[PDB]
Amino acid sequence: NVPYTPMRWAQDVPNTGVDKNTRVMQLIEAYRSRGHLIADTNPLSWVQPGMPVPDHRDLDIETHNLTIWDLDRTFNVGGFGGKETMTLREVLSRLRAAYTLKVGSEYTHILDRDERTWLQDRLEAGMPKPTQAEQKYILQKLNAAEAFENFLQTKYVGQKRFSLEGAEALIPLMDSAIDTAAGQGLDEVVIGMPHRGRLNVLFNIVGKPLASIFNEFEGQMEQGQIGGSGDVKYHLGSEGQHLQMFGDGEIKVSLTANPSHLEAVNPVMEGIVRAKQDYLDKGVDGKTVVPLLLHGDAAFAGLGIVPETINLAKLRGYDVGGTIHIVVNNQIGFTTTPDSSRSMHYATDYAKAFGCPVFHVNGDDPEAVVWVGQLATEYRRRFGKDVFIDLVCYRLRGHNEADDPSMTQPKMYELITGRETVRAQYTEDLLGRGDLSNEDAEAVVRDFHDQMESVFNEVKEGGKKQAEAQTGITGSQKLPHGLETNISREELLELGQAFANTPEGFNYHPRVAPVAKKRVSSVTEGGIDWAWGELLAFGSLANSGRLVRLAGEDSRRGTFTQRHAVAIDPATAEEFNPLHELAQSKGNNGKFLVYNSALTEYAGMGFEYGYSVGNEDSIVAWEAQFGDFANGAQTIIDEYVSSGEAKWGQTSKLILLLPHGYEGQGPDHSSARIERFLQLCAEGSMTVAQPSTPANHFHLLRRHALSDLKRPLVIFTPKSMLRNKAAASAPEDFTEVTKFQSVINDPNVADAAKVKKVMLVSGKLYYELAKRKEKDGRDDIAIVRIEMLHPIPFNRISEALAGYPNAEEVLFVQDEPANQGPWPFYQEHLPELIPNMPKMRRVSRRAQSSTATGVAKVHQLEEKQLIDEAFE
Amino acid sequence: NVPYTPMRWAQDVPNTGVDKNTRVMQLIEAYRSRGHLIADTNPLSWVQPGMPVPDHRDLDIETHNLTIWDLDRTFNVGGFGGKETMTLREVLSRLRAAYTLKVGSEYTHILDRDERTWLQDRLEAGMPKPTQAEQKYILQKLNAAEAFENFLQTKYVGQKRFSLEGAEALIPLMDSAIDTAAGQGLDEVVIGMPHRGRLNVLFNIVGKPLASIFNEFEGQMEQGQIGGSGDVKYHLGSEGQHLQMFGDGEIKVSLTANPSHLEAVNPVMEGIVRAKQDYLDKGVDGKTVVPLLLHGDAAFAGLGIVPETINLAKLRGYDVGGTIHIVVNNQIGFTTTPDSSRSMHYATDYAKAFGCPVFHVNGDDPEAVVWVGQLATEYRRRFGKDVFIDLVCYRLRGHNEADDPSMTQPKMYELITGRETVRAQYTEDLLGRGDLSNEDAEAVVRDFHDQMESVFNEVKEGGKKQAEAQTGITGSQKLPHGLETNISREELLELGQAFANTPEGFNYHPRVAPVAKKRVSSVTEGGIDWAWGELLAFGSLANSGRLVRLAGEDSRRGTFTQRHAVAIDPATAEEFNPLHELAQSKGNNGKFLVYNSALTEYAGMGFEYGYSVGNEDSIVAWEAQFGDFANGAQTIIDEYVSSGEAKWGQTSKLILLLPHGYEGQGPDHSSARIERFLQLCAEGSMTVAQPSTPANHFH
Ligand SMILES: CC(=O)SCCNC(=O)CCNC(=O)[C@H](O)C(C)(C)COP(=O)(O)OP(=O)(O)OC[C@H]1O[C@@H](n2cnc3c(N)ncnc32)[C@H](O)[C@@H]1OP(=O)(O)O
Numbered sequence A: 001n002v003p004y005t006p007m008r009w010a011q012d013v014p015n016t017g018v019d020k021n022t023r024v025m026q027l028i029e030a031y032r033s034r035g036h037l038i039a040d041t042n043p044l045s046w047v048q049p050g051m052p053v054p055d056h057r058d059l060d061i062e063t064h065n066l067t068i069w070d071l072d073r074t075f076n077v078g079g080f081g082g083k084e085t086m087t088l089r090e091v092l093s094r095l096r097a098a099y100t101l102k103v104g105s106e107y108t109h110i111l112d113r114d115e116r117t118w119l120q121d122r123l124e125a126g127m128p129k130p131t132q133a134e135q136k137y138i139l140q141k142l143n144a145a146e147a148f149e150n151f152l153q154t155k156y157v158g159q160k161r162f163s164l165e166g167a168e169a170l171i172p173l174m175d176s177a178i179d180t181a182a183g184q185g186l187d188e189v190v191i192g193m194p195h196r197g198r199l200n201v202l203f204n205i206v207g208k209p210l211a212s213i214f215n216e217f218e219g220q221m222e223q224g225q226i227g228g229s230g231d232v233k234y235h236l237g238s239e240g241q242h243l244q245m246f247g248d249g250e251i252k253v254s255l256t257a258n259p260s261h262l263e264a265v266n267p268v269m270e271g272i273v274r275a276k277q278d279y280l281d282k283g284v285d286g287k288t289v290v291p292l293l294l295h296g297d298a299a300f301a302g303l304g305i306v307p308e309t310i311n312l313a314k315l316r317g318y319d320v321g322g323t324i325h326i327v328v329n330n331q332i333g334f335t336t337t338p339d340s341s342r343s344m345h346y347a348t349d350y351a352k353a354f355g356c357p358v359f360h361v362n363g364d365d366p367e368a369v370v371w372v373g374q375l376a377t378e379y380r381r382r383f384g385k386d387v388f389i390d391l392v393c394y395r396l397r398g399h400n401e402a403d404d405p406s407m408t409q410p411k412m413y414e415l416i417t418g419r420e421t422v423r424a425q426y427t428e429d430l431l432g433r434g435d436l437s438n439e440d441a442e443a444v445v446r447d448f449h450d451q452m453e454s455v456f457n458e459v460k461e462g463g464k465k466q467a468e469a470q471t472g473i474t475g476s477q478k479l480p481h482g483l484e485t486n487i488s489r490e491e492l493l494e495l496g497q498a499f500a501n502t503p504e505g506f507n508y509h510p511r512v513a514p515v516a517k518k519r520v521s522s523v524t525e526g527g528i529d530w531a532w533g534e535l536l537a538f539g540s541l542a543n544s545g546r547l548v549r550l551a552g553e554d555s556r557r558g559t560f561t562q563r564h565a566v567a568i569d570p571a572t573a574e575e576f577n578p579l580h581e582l583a584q585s586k587g588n589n590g591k592f593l594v595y596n597s598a599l600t601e602y603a604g605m606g607f608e609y610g611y612s613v614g615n616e617d618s619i620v621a622w623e624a625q626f627g628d629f630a631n632g633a634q635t636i637i638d639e640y641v642s643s644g645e646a647k648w649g650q651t652s653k654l655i656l657l658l659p660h661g662y663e664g665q666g667p668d669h670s671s672a673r674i675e676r677f678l679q680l681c682a683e684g685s686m687t688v689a690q691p692s693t694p695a696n697h698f699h700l701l702r703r704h705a706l707s708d709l710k711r712p713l714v715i716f717t718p719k720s721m722l723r724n725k726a727a728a729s730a731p732e733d734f735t736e737v738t739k740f741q742s743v744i745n746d747p748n749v750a751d752a753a754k755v756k757k758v759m760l761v762s763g764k765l766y767y768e769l770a771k772r773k774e775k776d777g778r779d780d781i782a783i784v785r786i787e788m789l790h791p792i793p794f795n796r797i798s799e800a801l802a803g804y805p806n807a808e809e810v811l812f813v814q815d816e817p818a819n820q821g822p823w824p825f826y827q828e829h830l831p832e833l834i835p836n837m838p839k840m841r842r843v844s845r846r847a848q849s850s851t852a853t854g855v856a857k858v859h860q861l862e863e864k865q866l867i868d869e870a871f872e
Numbered sequence B: 001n002v003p004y005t006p007m008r009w010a011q012d013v014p015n016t017g018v019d020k021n022t023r024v025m026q027l028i029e030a031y032r033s034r035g036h037l038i039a040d041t042n043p044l045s046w047v048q049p050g051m052p053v054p055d056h057r058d059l060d061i062e063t064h065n066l067t068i069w070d071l072d073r074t075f076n077v078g079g080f081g082g083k084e085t086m087t088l089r090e091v092l093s094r095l096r097a098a099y100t101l102k103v104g105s106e107y108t109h110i111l112d113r114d115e116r117t118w119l120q121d122r123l124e125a126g127m128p129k130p131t132q133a134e135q136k137y138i139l140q141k142l143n144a145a146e147a148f149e150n151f152l153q154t155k156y157v158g159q160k161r162f163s164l165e166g167a168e169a170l171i172p173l174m175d176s177a178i179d180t181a182a183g184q185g186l187d188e189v190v191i192g193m194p195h196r197g198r199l200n201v202l203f204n205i206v207g208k209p210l211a212s213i214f215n216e217f218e219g220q221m222e223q224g225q226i227g228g229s230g231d232v233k234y235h236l237g238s239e240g241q242h243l244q245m246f247g248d249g250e251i252k253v254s255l256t257a258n259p260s261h262l263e264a265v266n267p268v269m270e271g272i273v274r275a276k277q278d279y280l281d282k283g284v285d286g287k288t289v290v291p292l293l294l295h296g297d298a299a300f301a302g303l304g305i306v307p308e309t310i311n312l313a314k315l316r317g318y319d320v321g322g323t324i325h326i327v328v329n330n331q332i333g334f335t336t337t338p339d340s341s342r343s344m345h346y347a348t349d350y351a352k353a354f355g356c357p358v359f360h361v362n363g364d365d366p367e368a369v370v371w372v373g374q375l376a377t378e379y380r381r382r383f384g385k386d387v388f389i390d391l392v393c394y395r396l397r398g399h400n401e402a403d404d405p406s407m408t409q410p411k412m413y414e415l416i417t418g419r420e421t422v423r424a425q426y427t428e429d430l431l432g433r434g435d436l437s438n439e440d441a442e443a444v445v446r447d448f449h450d451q452m453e454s455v456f457n458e459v460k461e462g463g464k465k466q467a468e469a470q471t472g473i474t475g476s477q478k479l480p481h482g483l484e485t486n487i488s489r490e491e492l493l494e495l496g497q498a499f500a501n502t503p504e505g506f507n508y509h510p511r512v513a514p515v516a517k518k519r520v521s522s523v524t525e526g527g528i529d530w531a532w533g534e535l536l537a538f539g540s541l542a543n544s545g546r547l548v549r550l551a552g553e554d555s556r557r558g559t560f561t562q563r564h565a566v567a568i569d570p571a572t573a574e575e576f577n578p579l580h581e582l583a584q585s586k587g588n589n590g591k592f593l594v595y596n597s598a599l600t601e602y603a604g605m606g607f608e609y610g611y612s613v614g615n616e617d618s619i620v621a622w623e624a625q626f627g628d629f630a631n632g633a634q635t636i637i638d639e640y641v642s643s644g645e646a647k648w649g650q651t652s653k654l655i656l657l658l659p660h661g662y663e664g665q666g667p668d669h670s671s672a673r674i675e676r677f678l679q680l681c682a683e684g685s686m687t688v689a690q691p692s693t694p695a696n697h698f699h
C-alpha cells in the first residue's frame, strides 16, 4: 500500500539539450501545480469506475528526463526549501511531504504572487506539531461527534437524523476555524449548512442544549411563532457562544434556518453576514463576521445557485470579506455516484473559476483537518477572499437511516462496512505514539456518555404532552392602529432641496438636470411623479436615522430611467447621492444605500431577504427589472419570504418592488404574476399592494417601515404610469393626508344616488377607465380603486359600496387574463366577506396558457374591447 | 500606443544559482499558462475601474532573473518551436506571437497531456494564412451582418431588435464552426442563443427568408399552432441548410425556441441534441449532431443554470460529444458593468472548473475569429469535450435601441461612440494589403443592399392585414376516441417472464429476488403493485418498437425502492435490464433506457423536455425524487412545458412523474403542488392525473 509510482529502471541520460537544473525546477512546478492529483486525501482505497482518471505523468521524473541516477546529484533549486542547492532526492522528499500527503492544495492558479507565495510558504513549511493538550482536545471533539450519533442510533433507531458518521472530522474542522476567528478578535461566525450532520453541529459547535434535541425526537418541538406550523428538526437555527480552549478569545456562533431545498441558504446567509457587518460599522478594515458555509459534494457540483452566490463575493454591495466554504465530500449523493453527478474532476472545481485556493484534506487525519481549518481562516483574514475546503470522507450508512445502499453501490459499501472509525483510529494513534494514556482515553468516552445518559433521563421523566391542533399566525403580530405617516412641510421642502445642493464642481447630465429641477420645484408646486414619491419615502426614513438599502438590477438609474437615485457628472464621472448626503447631515446617522445587483434573481433577492433578517431595523427593498423575472427566485419566494414566519418564526420586513402592467411589451414584460403571490398569501403572511398614486405609495412604504408588523411587503409598481400626469400627487398628499388608503373611492361622482354600476379596479387601468367615463359623461358609473390586495380591505370596500344605494351590479375590471391577476383571489373570497354585495361580473382578457400576446397591435385591440365591455 | 512594457535598463546578472536555461524554460511555461492575461483581445482600450487587475509579473523577464543582456544569448529550449537551441530574443518573439496577439488561450489547466500537446502544437504553429477567396468570403459575412442591422435601424427606427452592432464577428465565427462541422461529415448543428443578434443569426446563419423577418416588423407574425398566442420576434426558432462554400459538405442547421428568461434554453438544447443523436444511432464513434450554444457575458457569469448544464456534459445519459460555447463578451449587461456583474476575472472562467480549453479572441480581428471557430470545432471532434470561445467585443448602442447608455457609462461610451466598424476596418485592411480591389469592395456592399431593398419592396406592396382576436389552442389537436390500450394475455405473460430470464451467471440481490419472483407470478395470480403496473406500460411500449426513456434522481432503483428497473448482481456488480432485453428480442428495435440523473431539477427536467422535442416518437418520463422539489425547475414548467405550444407551436409528450401524498413526512416531502399545476392548465394545455390503481396508471 505505497501510493507513489515505483522508481523505474533506466539508463543515465547525458546533461545535453535542456539542462537538468531546468528539469528539476520543472518538476518542482509540476508538484506545486498538480501534486494534489496523487495526494493521499481519500480515506477509502476507492476509485469510482465511471469517473475519468486524470493524467498525472507530469509528477514522474521520467517525464522530465530525470532518472534514478540523478537522485544523489546536486541541483540549484533557486531558494526552494530555503536552500540554494539540493539533491534531487531531497527535492522529491520535500515535494512529496508538502503536496502528496493528507493535504492536497490547489493554489498555483491564483494570479496574485503575494497570495501564491503566502500559501506556498505555509504549505511547504508543513503542519506544526500539535501539543498533547491540543491532541486531547481533538479527540474529545471526535468522541463527542461519534458518541452523539451512536446515542441517537440506540435511543431512536427508526427516526431520520442524517448522521455524520464517516465525516466526524467535520466537527474539529469547524471548531478549528471558529477558534481561529476568535483569536483574530472577530465578532461572530454565521453558519449555513445542509441536513448532513446538522444535529451534531447544533450540539457540538453552536452549543444548543442537549435537552432540546432529545425533546425534538420525543415529539416536543420548540415553537418559533405563536400558532406556527413548524418544521422538521434538521431545518432549525440556533445561537451560542464559543470560548477559546487555549486562549482568552470569545466569539458568537449563529446557525441560520433553511428549507430542504439544497443550497438555497447560500445567498441568504451572505446577506445576514453583510447586514451584521454594516451594523458594526468598522469600515473596510472590519468585516468581522465570518460566513462559514457547508455544502454536500453532489449539491455543490449539481446546483447552480452555488457559483451564482460565490459570484457576489467581491461585489461592492455584497462583499463580506470572503466566505469559508466546506464541502463534505462523502463521494456520493443519495444513490448517484460522482461519475453520474458531475463532469468536473473535483466538486470544489468552481474555486478555479473565482481564483480561490482549494484544500483537499483526508477526513481520517484529524490533525491535518484541524490545520487546514486554521490555515483557511488565516487566509480569509489576510486576503479577504473565499477559500474552499474539500473534506474527503465517506457516508457510513445509507442516505437516511432507513435505506440500504448495498443494492446500488455494493462494491463501494464493501469497503465502507466494517471500517474502524476516525475516533478509534486517532485514539490508537495517540496511544501508539505515547501522547495519550489509557485511563485518559477511557475517561473521555465514559465522561461524555454519562453526560448524555443523565440528560436523556431528565427528558424521559418529564411528561409527554399529547398532540394538539395548530391555530395559525394571523394575530401573532399587531397592526399599527393610529399610526400617521405624513411628514411636515419643512421635511418635504428639505427633501426637495437635496437635489439642488450639488457638490462644488458637480453638474447634472443634460437629460437628468430637468428631473432634478422638477424634484426641487414639485415639493411646492406639485406634480410629484411615482419615482419621486418613492424616493421621498426612503429619504424621509433615512433622515430619521434608519439604514435604507435599495438593491436590484439597474436600480441606481432605474430600468425605466425614472429614479436617478445616484447622479453621475458626464465630465468627471463623479457620483452624487443627494438623499444619502441629506440623511448624513441630519445627525441621526441615517444611510441611503443604492446598489446595482448582478444578473441574478435567485441570489439577488435571497441576499436582500438575508439582509432583512440580519438587521431587523433596516429598510431593505429588492427591485426586479420586470416582475416576470421574479419566478427565477421561486425558491426564495416559496421557502423563505412567504412561509418563513410560519415554519421557523423568522420574520422579515423585505420589500419587493415588482414592475407590472399590460402595455403590449410581450408575455415576459407584462405580468408580475399577481395571482401567484395571492395564492401564497394566507393567515396574513404578507402585504400585497398595487398603489395608483405616488403619495399612496409613499404612505404604504412608511406605514410598513414605522410599524411593528414584521412581515414582507410586495408592491406591484407601474411602468407607463411613472410619467402619467393624471397620476401625479400634490404636496398636501404627503403632508396633510395622514394615512395610507387601501381603497380610494371615485373622486368624480356628482351624485351618488344616480350611480347604478360600480367598477372595482386595481392599478393603472383606473386612469383609462376614468378617462372613458369623463369622455362619455357616464354619471351612473363609479370607479373604485383597490390599492391593497392582501389583506382584503372588505370593510372599506363594503363602506364604498354602501355609499351607492342604487347600485345594481358590481364589475371587477382588470387588464390581466381571466385565470391571472387579482380576479381568481377576489372571486373566491370577497363574496363571503361581503354577503350583501351583488354578484360580481368579471371584465378582463380571456384565459390564456401564456401571460400575454406577443403581438403589439393585438394588445391595443383587446384593450379597446376590454374598456367597451366595461361600459356596456 | 505600444502595448508591451518597455525594456528596462539593468545590469547583467551572473549565471550563478539557478541556471539561465532553467529561467528560460520557466518563462516559456509562464507564457503558455498566463500569457492570455496580457493578450490583445480587447477591441477597446478600456479597463473597468472597479475590476481587480490581476498580477502578471510572471511574464516579465526580470521576474525570472533575466535581463536585456541575455536577449542574444543562446539557451536550450528542449524542442520548443521545433528547435533544441534558441536565443532568448527568438523565444520571446515566438511566445508573444502565440499567446499575446489577438488570441488568448487557456489550456495549461487541462490535465490530459495529449489534449494539452494537441492544443499547444496548434496554438504555437499559428493561424495559417487564408486565401483571397476565403478573405473575401469573411468580408461578405461581415458586410451582411452590419448591413442587415443598419437596414432595420433605417426602416424600423422605433422598434426593439437587440442589434449585434459591435459584435458582427459572431456571424463569421458561427459560419466557420458550422462549415468545419460540415467538412467533418456531421449531420446537424443545433443552436441555442439569447436575444443578442438573434435576427441576424436567423438570416445570415440559419437561412430564414428575409421576407419573413420583414413581415414580423410590419406586424404579420407567423402562427405556430392554430389559435396560438405567439411570442416576440426574437424568441422564435427556424431550420435551414448550410452548404460549404469551399467544399462539397452540407449540414442541417436548426435554432431552438426559447423564452426571455436567459440561459433556460441550455438544458433544453442539450436534450434535443441527445435525442437526435440517439435517433441516428451511430454509436460511441458517432455524436454527429453539434450543440452550438451562445451566451451573454453577464448571463454566463450570473445565472447558475449555465454551470449546472455544463455539469451534464460527460454523464452517461446526457453526453452529446461536447458543446461549443460562444460567450458574446460585450463587457456589459443592461447597465451593470463586469465589476458589479461577476467576481471572476473572465466570464468563461467556469471552463477551468470542467477542465476545458478557453479561447479569448479579439472581435475586431475577423481572421483570428474564423480560425478559433475552426480550432474549437476540431477540438470537439477529436476529444469529445466542451470548448469555450470568449468573443471579446462591445455593444455599440444601449441595451435596447431606445436607451441612452451615456447616463451611467459615460467614459466607456466615449470610446465606443465614433469608432469605425469591424467591417470598415477589415475592408481597409484588405485594400491596404492588396488582397482586395476597390470595385469588388463596393460590389459587396451594393449587391447585398440591393437584395434587401428588393425584398423590402415586395413586403411593402403586400396588403397589411388588420388586428384580429386570437381564439385558442383547445381543439388544435384531436383526442384519441375509440383507442384501446389493453394488451393480450400472451404479451402480459411474456412481460412477466422477462424477470425470470436472467443472464447465465446472474443472481438477484436477496432483497430484490422476492420482487422479481412476485413480478413473474403476479401476471397470472394477481396482486400487481404500482411499480409493476408502471413498468408493464413502459415495457409494452418498448416491445412495440418505441424508444422509452426514464430519467430522474435515483430512478433505476426508485426513491422508495419500488422500481428495480435495473438489477445489480451483488457479487459481480453486473447490471441487468429485463425489459430492455425483452424489447430488443422482439425485433422492432425497441429500447428501455433508464438513467440516474445528476442533482438537478432545472437541468434535469429541462433535458427531458428537450429530448421529447428532439424526438417526437420517443416516450420520455422525468421523475422527481419528491414533487416538492419540482419548484426548482419552475422556469422549465412555466416557460416550456405549460406554455410551449401556445407561444411557439412547439409540442411535447413529456411525462412528469411527481411523487405526492400526505403521510406525515414534513412540508417538503408531502405535496407536489397540485394547485400550481392546475393554475397553469388552460385551453387543454396538458393532462393532469392522480391514478388510484396500477392498472389505471398503466392505461
Ligand atoms: C399582513 C397583515 O396585514 S396581517 C392582517 C391581519 N388580519 C387578517 O389577516 C385577517 C382579517 N383581515 C381583515 O380584517 C382585513 O383584511 C383588514 C385587517 C385589512 C381590515 O380591513 P379594513 O378595515 O377594510 O382595512 P383598512 O385599510 O381600513 O385597515 C384598518 C386599519 O388596519 C391597518 N392595516 C390594514 N392592513 C395593514 C397592513 N397590511 N399593514 C399595516 N397596517 C395595516 C390600517 O392602517 C388601518 O389603521 P387605522 O385603524 O389607523 O385606520
Ligand SMILES: CC(=O)SCCNC(=O)CCNC(=O)[C@H](O)C(C)(C)COP(=O)(O)OP(=O)(O)OC[C@H]1O[C@@H](n2cnc3c(N)ncnc32)[C@H](O)[C@@H]1OP(=O)(O)O
Residues within 6 Å of the ligand: B474, B479, B480, B481, B482, B483, B683, B684, B685, B686, B687
Ligand atoms: C389536454 C386534453 O385532453 S385537451 C381536451 C379538449 N377539451 C377541452 O380542453 C375542453 C373541455 N372539454 C372536456 O372536458 C371534454 O368534455 C372531455 C371529453 C375532455 C371530458 O371528458 P368526459 O367526457 O367527461 O369523460 P371521458 O374521460 O370519458 O372522456 C371522453 C373521451 O375523451 C378521451 N379523453 C379525455 N381526456 C383525454 C386526454 N387527456 N387524453 C386522451 N384522451 C382523453 C377519453 O379517452 C374518452 O375516449 P372514448 O371516447 O374512446 O371513451
Ligand SMILES: Cc1ncc(C[n+]2csc(CCOP(=O)(O)OP(=O)(O)O)c2C)c(N)n1
Residues within 6 Å of the ligand: A196, A260, A261, A262, A295, A296, A297, A298, A299, A300, A328, A330, A332, A333, A334, A395, A399, B553, B599, B600, B601, B625, B629, B632
Ligand atoms: C434541490 C433539491 N433537490 C433534491 C433534494 C433531495 N435530496 C436531499 S439530500 C439529497 C442528496 C444530496 O447529496 P449531497 O449534496 O452529496 O449531500 P449528502 O447527503 O451526501 O451529504 C437529495 C437528492 C433536495 N433536498 N433539494
Ligand SMILES: Cc1ncc(C[n+]2csc(CCOP(=O)(O)OP(=O)(O)O)c2C)c(N)n1
Residues within 6 Å of the ligand: A553, A599, A600, A601, A625, A629, A632, B196, B260, B261, B262, B295, B296, B297, B298, B299, B300, B328, B330, B332, B333, B334, B395, B399
Ligand atoms: C433571468 C433573467 N433575468 C433578467 C433578465 C433581464 N435582461 C434582459 S437582457 C439582460 C442583460 C443581459 O446581459 P448579458 O448577458 O451580458 O447580454 P447582452 O444583453 O449584453 O448581450 C437582462 C438582465 C432576463 N431576461 N432574464
Ligand SMILES: [Mg+2]
Residues within 6 Å of the ligand: A296, A297, A298, A328, A329, A330, A331, A332, A333
Ligand atoms: Mg454527498
Ligand SMILES: [Mg+2]
Residues within 6 Å of the ligand: B296, B297, B298, B328, B329, B330, B331, B332, B333
Ligand atoms: Mg453583455
